[PDB]
Paper text:
The [name]–Gs complex was then assembled through co-expression in insect cells, followed by purification at pH values of 7.5, 6.8 and 6.0, respectively. Using cryo-EM single particle analysis, the structures of pH7.5GPR4–Gs, [name].8GPR4–Gs and [name].0GPR4–Gs complexes were determined at global resolutions of 2.9 Å, 3.1 Å and 3.1 Å, respectively. Structurally, the seven-transmembrane (7TM) bundles in [name]–Gs complexes at pH values ranging from 6.0 to 7.5 exhibit similar folds. The extracellular loop 2 (ECL2) adopts a conformation analogous to that of the resolved δ-branch GPCRs, which forms a β-sheet hairpin structure. Of note, two disulfide bonds (C903.25–C168ECL2 and C9N-term–C2587.25) are observed to stabilize the receptor’s extracellular domain, with the disulfide bond C9N-term–C2587.25 unique for [name]. Specifically, in the [name]–Gs complex structures, E392 and Y391 in the α5 helix of Gαs form polar contacts with Q451.60 and E512.38 from TMs 1–2 and ICL1 region of [name].
Author numbering:
A (entry chain R): 7 to 301
B (entry chain N): 1 to 126
C (entry chain B): 3 to 340
D (entry chain A): 11 to 47, 53 to 61, 205 to 251, 264 to 394
E (entry chain C): 6 to 61
The structure:
């Protein structure tokens, strides 16, 4: 049994916008991977982090289409139970890998710009590879909770949920709280702090023009803002739903109305996957230059 | 070979005027930042004037500011110098110097005692 | 007195100019009417040797055509096994500023020179081991631009004090000092018979020297800027000079005049390093546009472009057997081309 | 057989690779500097080339003094293109015009258009006493000094008349006119005044190198 | 000083470079052409070396 969770915009907005994101991100994410690899071959530590972020977004893009089918057929699945625990596992956890990798990029940038004559050991390709592998393994392990439990769930309204139970469960509520707080906000907090320190350092510079500091400020503000604009809606709704199910597990009809907001916010959460490549490689002059040289 | 044959000079009373040109038969004359350098009696080589490849970019030092003109006639391959309102300051062997390398705007060495392209200066006693 | 001597010098200059003009029946372009074109050469990087941390200023080959000495500003003299891309020896240098490195014709010795005004010879083969300095040849007033071994106990060095010197290694003292250039000598290329060597300086002139007599037989003046590289034609009494005027020229030692002018409207960058193939047909020149160049010596036309470096191509050498071109550059990478 | 030789080559290459890795760490640790224009700066910092070492805040700096060479510099100064900075000391008291063209040539050199120049104005007290005398090489060889006013932003530097200040900053802007024109963040010409009684020159070179490395980080970290 | 030590030294060196015999540029080009033609076959840079006998 469960709640009569049904909606209209979950037929159009999440599927169509996922189509948009997969159409315009895969080439851009591949370009970001190419730029990162070119940085790596030039002994640039940022190449490892950018390439890791690119591959995370690549898995997200490749696993989106089955989820497009999932939302398209009024929240009903077509594949089997194993496909759930694989594709849904990559559908989740991948935005969180992306945020952790953006935080790693921001910390590397802060360690370089703010401290140009210190921490030379941590700014090495070996250290970057070690951190990339460590974060990949740590994120996958800490997000491995769903595979232990059961995922494919059938309700009383012809809805075969693939990963997400709208009647909700205790363990999924707690892991949702985890992925809201430790997986999205804290890496984003570190990103904002690192880019604020970078802004302070660029302000301190005397060889930078006023226009250069303005460009740095605009770039840092865009990098901080796009992440929140994409993620904060969905994570706010998750926090609200998990708090409700910690308070009132019985009353779940509110899920029917919040269904549209929830799934549209997931669709908007997908936007960062295309935001990151054009805002980390294409926007910068050097990365665009090496991409054009590659082209 | 690179030739910088100076001419003109002679003797002139203070407040007079002379001119001096430098035939070039070794280089292009159009892509070198040619310039004038003199050694006053008892002093080393000191910079006087400088004209660039196009002739638009023009520089002088303080002593020769406003009283000296550089022409740089490409067709005649001769770098001129109109000397005006003369003072006993010159009394030197005025010779022309070429830029070490073409298509550059950094004449790195002109004042060296043994720089290859400096020519044989002509005395201008005043 | 001084004016009379200057007039005599001008008369002598006119006399030698008239003699050269009379001997100037034609130029090397006279054969650029019937020779079949060499065709477009397409040589790829058969290996990139990545061990250097700074710009590879100079490099040299051994007689075996297998070993490779390469010098750079990190203070390293790496001997490379070009066949198997292995670093046989890594010789640290006391002074990091090295502009030249040489390989002894019989092996067993490597000479490096730079801003230190000293040429140091290293004993590659050692009964004990730990390749170390054997003789530290000092006496040049300025820096060292090129050092060329001729055998054990003898080295020929060109310096920036307008002098070239021949040193007896065992005694450590100069044997003959060569004087007559008015600018910093840049490159030195010994003759195959190893009885003469030409040198290019910063006075737009190149001079032929006799290693035994010790004077300059011929002085060649055809360039309009500093000569940056010089290299003997394999044999046939010729050599080629690359200058900062973006022009390569070929001089014959017997006619005492220039023969070709390898230049183009597009090129405005100077030639840093110059070299020849075994046959002498191809003249390979490294420019400042981060790109080496291939010239047909007999037909001035260009016939190849060895792009692949991101910075100034500093050194360029061709194997004695003529099987490879090992182009060093400021990109800190060394590439071998077939 | 050949397998023994191959193993020997592999072992030798392994040793050389380890040594070169350590040398890579060392090279990326130390910063190279070129000093152009003085032995007094070397005295206050602590043979064709003179290699001198110092450390401030546990950072490795190497300065190089070409002290046994000719006056020609168009060829051996190209080797100093990977250096962090080219320290340029001037008398700042026609010596000064020659210094201005040496600086101009360094600025406009093709291979020094990525290397910033820490100008120092090696001596200033001679300029003070020259403008006190008046008729020395301050106004005669530079007429515009009389027809020039002290910029407002210039710090007073107490202990001197406005004439000392105007002459000092006049030479500073004479050196900065070449620096601003045909010059961007690639190389910046940090201008400073030299105090022979203090050791602040080392600290100032440290700060300038910090800013330079920060700029190269901004460029290589794509923060632009 | 500067007369006999410099200018007369220059004229002596010029006399040395003037007394030597010169050949016409015709032979100065024929010798180079003949050497390039004679050693044309033995030049891997010029003629592509067979892959079997190519150490690189």
């Amino acid at each position: 049994e469960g709640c009569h969770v049904d909606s209209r915009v979950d037929h159009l907005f999440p599927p169509s916008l996922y189509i948009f994101v997969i159409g315009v991100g895969l080439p851009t994410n591949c370009l970001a991977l190419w730029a990162a690899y070119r940085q790596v071959q030039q002994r640039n530590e940022l190449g490892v982090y950018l390439m890791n972020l690119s591959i995370a977004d690549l898995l997200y893009i490749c696993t989106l289409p089955l989820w497009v089918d999932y939302f398209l057929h009024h929240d009903n699945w077509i594949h089997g139970p194993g496909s759930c625990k694989l594709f849904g596992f990559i559908f989740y956890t991948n935005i969180y890998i992306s945020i952790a990798f953006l935080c790693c990029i921001s910390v590397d940038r802060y360690l370089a710009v703010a401290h140009p004559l210190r921490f030379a050991r941590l700014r090495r390709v070996k250290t970057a590879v070690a951190v990339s592998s460590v974060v990949w393994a740590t994120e996958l392990g800490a997000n491995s909770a769903p595979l232990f439990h059961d995922e494919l769930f059938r309700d009383r309204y012809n809805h075969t949920f693939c990963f997400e139970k709208f009647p909700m469960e205790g363990w999924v509520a707690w892991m949702n709280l985890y992925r809201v707080f430790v997986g999205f906000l804290f890496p984003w907090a570190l990103m904002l702090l690192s880019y604020r320190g970078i802004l302070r350092a660029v302000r301190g510079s005397v060889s930078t023009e006023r226009q250069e500091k303005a460009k740095i400020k605009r770039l840092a503000l865009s990098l901080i803002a796009i992440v929140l604009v994409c993620f904060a809606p969905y994570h706010v709704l998750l926090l609200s739903r998990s708090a409700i199910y910690l308070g009132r597990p019985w009353d779940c009809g509110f899920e029917e109305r919040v269904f549209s907001a929830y799934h549209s916010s997931l669709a908007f959460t997908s936007l960062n996957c295309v935001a990151d490549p054009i805002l980390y490689c294409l926007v910068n002059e050097g990365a665009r230059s090496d991409v054009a040289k590659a082209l | 070979q690179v030739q910088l044959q100076e001419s003109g000079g002679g003797l002139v009373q203070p407040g007079g005027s002379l001119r001096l040109s430098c035939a070039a038969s070794g280089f292009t004359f159009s892509n070198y930042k040619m310039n004038w350098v003199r050694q006053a009696p008892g002093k080393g080589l000191e910079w006087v004037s400088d004209i660039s490849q196009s002739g638009a970019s023009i520089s002088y030092t303080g002593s020769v500011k406003g009283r000296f003109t550089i022409s740089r006639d490409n067709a005649k391959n001769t770098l001129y110098l109109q000397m005006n309102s003369l003072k006993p300051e010159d009394t030197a062997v005025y010779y022309c110097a070429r830029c070490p390398a073409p298509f550059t705007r950094d004449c790195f060495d002109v004042t060296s005692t043994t720089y290859a392209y400096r020519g044989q200066g002509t005395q201008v006693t005043v | 007195e001084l004016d009379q001597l200057r007039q005599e010098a001008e008369q002598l200059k006119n006399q030698i100019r008239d003699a050269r003009k009379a001997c100037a029946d034609a130029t090397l372009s006279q054969i650029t009417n019937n020779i079949d074109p060499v065709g477009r050469i397409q040589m790829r990087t058969r290996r990139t040797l990545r061990g250097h941390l700074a710009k590879i200023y100079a490099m040299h080959w051994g007689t075996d055509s297998r070993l490779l000495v390469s010098a750079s500003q990190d203070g390293k003299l790496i001997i490379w096994d070009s066949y198997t891309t292995n670093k046989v020896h890594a010789i640290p240098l006391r002074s990091s500023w090295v502009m030249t490195c040489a390989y002894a014709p019989s092996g067993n010795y490597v000479a490096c020179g730079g801003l230190d005004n000293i040429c140091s010879i290293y004993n590659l083969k050692t009964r004990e081991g730990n390749v170390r300095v054997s003789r530290e040849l000092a006496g040049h007033t300025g820096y060292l631009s090129c050092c060329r071994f001729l055998d054990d106990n003898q080295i020929v060095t060109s310096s920036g004090d307008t002098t070239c010197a021949l040193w007896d290694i065992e005694t450590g003292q100069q044997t003959t000092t060569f004087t007559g250039h008015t600018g910093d000598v840049m490159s030195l290329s010994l003759a195959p018979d190893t009885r003469l060597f030409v040198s290019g300086a910063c006075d737009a002139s190149a001079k032929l020297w006799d290693v035994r007599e010790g004077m300059c037989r011929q002085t060649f003046t055809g360039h309009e800027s500093d000569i940056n590289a010089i290299c003997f034609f394999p044999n046939g009494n010729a050599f080629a000079t690359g200058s900062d005027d973006a022009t390569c020229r070929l001089f014959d030692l017997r006619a005492d005049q220039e023969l070709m002018t390898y230049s183009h409207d597009n090129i405005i960058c100077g030639i840093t390093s110059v070299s020849f193939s075994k046959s002498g047909r191809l003249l390979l020149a490294g420019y400042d546009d981060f790109n080496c160049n291939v010239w047909d010596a007999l037909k001035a036309d260009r016939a190849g472009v060895l792009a692949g470096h991101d910075n100034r191509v500093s050194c360029l050498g061709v194997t004695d057997d003529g099987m490879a071109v090992a182009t060093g550059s400021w990109d800190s990478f060394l590439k071998i081309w077939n | 057989d050949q397998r023994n030789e191959e193993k020997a080559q592999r072992e030798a290459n392994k040793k050389i690779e380890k040594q070169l890795q350590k040398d890579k760490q060392v090279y990326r640790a130390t910063h190279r500097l070129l000093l152009l224009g003085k032995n007094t700066i070397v005295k206050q910092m602590r043979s064709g080339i003179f290699e001198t070492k110092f450390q401030v805040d546990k950072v490795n700096f190497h300065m190089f003094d070409v002290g046994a060479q000719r006056d020609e510099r168009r060829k051996w100064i190209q080797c100093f293109n990977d250096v962090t900075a080219i320290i340029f000391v001037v008398a700042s008291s026609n010596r000064l015009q020659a210094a201005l063209k040496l600086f101009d040539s360094i600025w406009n050199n093709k291979w020094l258009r990525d290397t910033s120049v820490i100008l120092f104005l090696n001596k200033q007290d001679l300029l003070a006493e020259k403008v006190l005398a008046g008729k020395s090489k301050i106004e005669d060889y530079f007429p515009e000094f009389a027809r020039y006013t002290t910029p407002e932003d210039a710090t007073p530097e107490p202990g001197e008349d406005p004439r000392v200040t105007r002459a000092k900053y006049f030479i500073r802007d004479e050196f900065l006119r070449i620096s601003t024109a045909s010059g961007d963040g690639r190389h910046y010409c940090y201008p400073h005044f030299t105090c022979a009684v203090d050791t602040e020159n080392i600290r100032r070179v440290f700060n300038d190198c910090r800013d330079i490395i920060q700029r190269m980080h901004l460029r290589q970290y794509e923060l632009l | 000083t500067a007369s006999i030590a410099q200018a007369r030294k220059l004229v002596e060196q010029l006399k040395m470079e003037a007394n030597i015999d010169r050949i016409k540029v015709s032979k100065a080009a024929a010798d180079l052409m003949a050497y390039c033609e004679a050693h044309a076959k033995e030049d891997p840079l010029l003629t592509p070396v067979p892959a079997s006998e190519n150490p690189f």
